Design a binder for this molecule. Structure first.
Ligand SMILES: *[C@@H]1O[C@H](CO)[C@@H](O)[C@H](O[C@@H]2O[C@H](CO)[C@@H](O)[C@H](O)[C@H]2NC(C)=O)[C@H]1NC(C)=O
Ligand SMILES: *[C@@H]1O[C@H](CO)[C@@H](O[C@@H]2O[C@H](CO)[C@@H](O)[C@H](O)[C@H]2NC(C)=O)[C@H](O)[C@H]1NC(C)=O
Lengths: 360, 114
């Protein structure tokens, strides 16, 4: 009844992002897919249990574990994580009375999607989570009948902040031949190591956050695709156990990334019937044919000398229009914001590293 | 009476408790919400997740190790603490018999007067 499959769902979702300018919330994707288990039934429920690597006997305790994990994200003010979950079902849908009695208090809203649904849903999400204009106008038509929104916000402050006295160094890529970017520099002791993963050298560093058990792990290596394709929750825990105190001259770029990615491919590889109106069985919520045809995530991260600010919104909706982005980074590094107690991976991505590397 | 009326004074500590009828299934969680669309807390065993503007200060969860009941205590009752309070049990099957989520819900009207 562990959440290993829960975290590995988002891990695989990240592993399927064919790009290098990535900023993703594995916890947001995993949480959406896991909350989908409440209305799901039959084949959809079985697929979701398979992807989470859970049985019907372990679904109850799993949620329990999840709740406990959620109880360990709002434990301070210096560093915290706020999570909100909203479901919007059309008034014409005949929701089962038991389902509504059980789950309507966890943000189940009813409206007419043909009467300015965009502004109403944006207002509800803004009132519940503070993030405004989460859903775009081209993601809602007069045909959509179901919309699930999952927002997560992480405010972080380095336990050992960078000195403002830093340099502005030029990173070398092929897209941007040479781009000058501010690079924070700090010489101090940190929990790191330089390990080998399947005969491949990777340097790992941990940056703790003040007044919390959340940490930003940084990994630097030759082929980051190899490091990406070989990470699981248990292997991540083992790598964390391999880290220890040692002196480091950290050169971390002051990066700010934003992504708006269609994740329908991986979500359909995990739950095909959820994205097919002929097989979509959500009989726990309603006997009416409901499905999801589009799934996106909008993520953003900003890192400075004081800390990190990250936002993410996972949206399951009926229609959308977007174009994929493809940037080829050379010799990048991978960051992972992880809760060291629950193993939750709140955020993770990939930033273009300077030619000198993160640890000279 | 559809709602037990718990009458208390300004400044008292109101201890609200509820009992689950199903005593043979695994309690997934126990929830407390203020019926005017306000979630107070969600207790998973001894881990309590407080929603909205709620902390361990005014409302304390008093039954972390007792699974057959759920109990909270509101401290220093004010005029805004009055209203309907709802306790709920989310339970699952222990032996995969009748695979479904069982749900219990009870309400009580707290009247805090001078
Ligand atoms: C970090 O690690 C564990 C996580 O449970 C914990 O010992 C530290 O503080 C704990 O917070 C827990 C709730 O998240 C709670 O069970 C407990 O009161 C407290 N434990 C203490 C003080 O020994 C976590 N640290 C921080 C800063 O959150
Ligand atoms: C707890 O469960 C028991 C057993 O189902 C309930 O006792 C019966 O309740 C029904 C209606 O809920 C009555 O028609 C029966 O007469 C009751 N007794 C028997 C012997 O069957 C009991 O009411 C439940 N308590 C609750 C829901 O608070």
């Amino acid at each position: 009844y562990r959440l290993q499959g829960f975290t590995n769902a988002g891990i695989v979702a990240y592993k399927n992002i064919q790009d290098d300018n990535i900023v993703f919330s594995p916890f947001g994707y995993s949480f959406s897919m896991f909350m989908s288990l409440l209305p799901a039934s039959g084949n959809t429920r079985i697929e979701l249990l398979k992807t989470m690597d859970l049985r019907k006997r372990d679904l109850g305790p799993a949620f329990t574990e999840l709740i406990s994990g959620l109880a360990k994200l709002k434990t301070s003010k210096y560093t915290y994580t706020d999570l909100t979950y909203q479901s919007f079902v059309d008034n014409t849908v005949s929701i089962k009375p038991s389902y509504y009695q059980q789950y309507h208090r966890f943000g189940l809203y009813r409206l007419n999607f043909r009467r300015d649904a965009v502004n109403k849903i944006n207002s509800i999400v803004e009132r519940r989570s503070g993030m405004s204009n989460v859903v775009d106008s081209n993601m809602l038509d007069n045909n959509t009948l179901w919309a699930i929104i999952n927002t997560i916000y992480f405010k972080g402050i380095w336990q050992y902040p960078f000195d403002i006295t830093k340099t502005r160094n030029a990173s070398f890529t092929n897209k941007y031949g040479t781009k000058t970017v501010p690079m924070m520099n700090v010489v101090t002791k940190l929990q790191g190591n330089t390990i080998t993963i399947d005969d491949e050298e990777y340097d790992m560093v941990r940056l703790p956050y003040k007044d919390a058990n959340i940490s930003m792990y940084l990994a630097i290596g030759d082929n980051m695709t190899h490091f990406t394709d070989s990470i699981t929750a248990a292997k991540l825990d083992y790598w964390s156990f391999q880290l220890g105190n040692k002196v480091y001259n950290l050169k971390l770029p002051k990066f700010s990334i934003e992504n708006k990615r269609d994740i329908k491919s991986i979500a359909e590889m995990m739950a095909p019937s959820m994205f097919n109106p002929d097989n979509a069985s959500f009989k726990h919520m309603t006997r009416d044919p409901l499905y999801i045809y589009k799934m996106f995530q909008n993520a953003k991260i900003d890192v400075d000398e004081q800390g990190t600010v990250a936002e993410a919104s996972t949206i399951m909706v009926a229609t959308a229009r977007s174009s994929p982005e493809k940037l080829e980074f050379n010799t990048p590094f991978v960051f992972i914001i992880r809760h060291d107690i629950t193993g939750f991976i709140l955020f993770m991505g990939k930033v273009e590293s300077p030619g000198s590397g993160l640890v000279p | 009476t559809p709602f037990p009326q718990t009458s208390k004074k300004i400044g008292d500590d109101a201890t609200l408790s509820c009992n689950r009828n199903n005593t043979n299934d695994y309690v997934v969680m126990s929830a407390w919400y203020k019926e005017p669309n306000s979630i107070i807390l969600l207790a998973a065993k001894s881990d309590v997740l407080y929603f909205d503007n709620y902390t361990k200060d005014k409302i304390s969860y008093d039954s972390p190790y007792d699974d057959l009941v759920t109990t909270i205590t509101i401290k220093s009752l004010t005029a805004r603490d009055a209203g309907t309070y709802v306790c709920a049990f989310f339970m699952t099957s222990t032996t995969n018999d009748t695979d479904k989520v069982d749900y219990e819900e009870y309400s009580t009207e707290l009247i805090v007067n001078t």
